[PDB]
Symmetry: D2
Subunit: 217 residues, 4 copies
């Protein structure tokens, strides 16, 4: 309840309907429980890796237009940090699961992936810096909160790769990317209302992305 401090708290609360569906999504619950079929995870990894590449490009775009040096530093940190944290982890997860980077490059993105990646890049290439951040926040934050909610099931999760995947989102370093991004938005000088459309769309794509990964769309 105390995360509901400022602008970003307001945004999170407005998206509660969406986020509760994300938090309660069967893909998520199964993944953390250890019951998710490995083929679905494989399919998810292929899709999500492509999303991360394009997510890094989106951060790059936002960085190209940061209204201050510090803000530019934050976006770059989020971008290199995405390559150095998540993507490195994914690269290793693919390898352990018998998928190559070439397989990744050859995996066709599903429709939601195309649309979501498009939305983030479009926004980050054309909208105000803080609007971009608002569009990028749900991606970062939802994954942390998902972890914060289903973390307990990991101790009973028999699958090693699912646990390794989840470890990033429980890590203080990842929660710090989240905290840092929220701090940027809470001090942006802009209202929750101005930021809402961006935060909302991205949140809706996060829900469709999990669904798409669940039904191997």
């Amino acid at each position: 309840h105390h995360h509901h401090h400022g602008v970003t708290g307001e945004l999170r609360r407005r998206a509660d309907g969406i986020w509760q569906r994300i938090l309660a999504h069967p893909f998520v619950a199964e993944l953390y429980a250890g019951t998710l079929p490995m083929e679905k995870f494989k399919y998810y990894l292929l899709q999500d890796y492509n999303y991360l590449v394009n997510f890094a490009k989106a951060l790059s775009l936002a960085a190209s237009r940061a209204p201050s040096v510090d803000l530019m530093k934050t976006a770059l940190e989020l971008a290199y940090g995405t390559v150095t944290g998540e993507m490195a982890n994914y690269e290793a997860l693919l390898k352990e699961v018998g998928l190559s980077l070439r397989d990744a490059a050859e995996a066709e993105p599903n429709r939601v992936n195309v649309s979501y990646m498009a939305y983030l890049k479009s926004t980050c290439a054309l909208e105000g810096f803080y609007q971009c951040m608002a569009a990028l926040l749900p991606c970062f934050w939802s994954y942390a909160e998902i972890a914060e909610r289903h973390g307990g099931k990991l101790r009973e999760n028999p699958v090693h790769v699912y646990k390794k995947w989840a470890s990033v989102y429980l890590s203080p370093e990842y929660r710090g990317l989240v905290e840092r991004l929220r701090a940027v938005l809470d001090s942006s000088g802009l209202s929750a209302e101005e930021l809402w459309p961006y935060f909302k769309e991205a949140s809706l794509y996060e829900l469709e992305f999990w669904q798409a990964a669940y039904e191997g769309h």
Copy 2:
């Protein structure tokens, strides 16, 4: 209309295009049986589209690899403010909707996605790849007209007929024709351009469906 790279693209997208061509929204629209509320809903959505479409052409224009290609991109763009957009401005007014209503209409999810796809592409990808993403949007509407044009003669609704007149017009067809020749002169293969032509085509299908369900 199957003689070069764009013909190759069209034929590879046949599965998708046939679904578009046979979509109930389209058939009803040309037949004159489409409920006015669905048309209104469609007009609101499509304006936001066209505005963003214009921006996409602008972006593509911004890095045409030749003056000619830029001049082209740029015409299609301005010609989208005074060509399709002008028309739509009237069509709305006749239906009792203001530009303000247009500005206030929330785009549906497909519209957001599609607009994002075109702008994203046009801001980032090679000029020809952008054109390949933009072609289905232009061409499908011409072909839709080429297919359902006959029903207009029996179509009792004036606004639907006025809407359709643009896509039957030689000026629109020529636009389409020129756009193809740009691509067919690109010197790139179909498979290089396929992904872009495909996605856009898929969006066109989802757009009609979204307009049909009042999404």
Copy 3:
């Protein structure tokens, strides 16, 4: 006197130092007087078409993120109304002087040209829409004011091409362009201070451009 009004008037008056140097530049005075050596004009035409081409692209970029349909409609007009006007005539100015569009494509831009074109494109790709307009205004406005100042010497100007060149910048269609550009900025709600850096740099480039054209750089 009545170009003293609002934000753009403020900008003009701050750039007075720079603008008076432009308005009194020998290239300009000789061009209107009819004394400018044809070779310098030819050189100028080669450079300036490359400019106009890139100017068009810059408008296109600004258009790409106009914050309103009206503002966008404008940008798009200038960008196309630059292929349609200025660029169209220039094509005739060159043909008359025995230079082809191919010659234009092959003319290497001088360093100022490169720099200026880069500045406009860079700005229009990255900066706020109004900031872009502020960068673009000097280019438009200086040429009108140059005409407003040296227009009288045209009746005594024996060179037809120079007079044809000048006719655009005396035309109500061009002068109005400037008027609309100014009103766009004057209604922005942005201060002079915020727009100054962009107006200034462009103005400095206009001065260097004339100098470069004068010395055959």
Copy 4:
């Protein structure tokens, strides 16, 4: 040896002027007046910010995941490497980040920053890299040439400034950027105009910093 070697050789006339520039020679020797260094730090810090933005743009358009990573590592390594140093240098010399934000860029700086951002937002990825290479590489080579004068350079800040360009980590950014270009699939000739313009700006930038513009 490869495409980038070809580029360097073609720009030899320009680079020898950069390598022999009095600003550079004085900076490494320790004879550069502190006011000129201060003036340079203000200008160059602004340049590095915009240089990072340029790399960001080029990254947004990398034709491969790996290429996107390289640009990203260059951009971020520019923040955490060179920019962090300049921040320490500015502070040690009594200049704030605010002073930096308020410093008006000189004409060459505006033009050079514009060139890089223009290119990186609109040209092919490898053309961008060709535009960015001279910036990175010239500084390494300058260091490679004037490094010896440092041992006896009495000025600490000049030495600290130079330390980055002698460092294996900075040379690695350079080597990695060359390798990207050497295997780009493109000719020296296609890349030349970009490498050249940047090189010419590097020379004007030093001159501008020397004359206090």
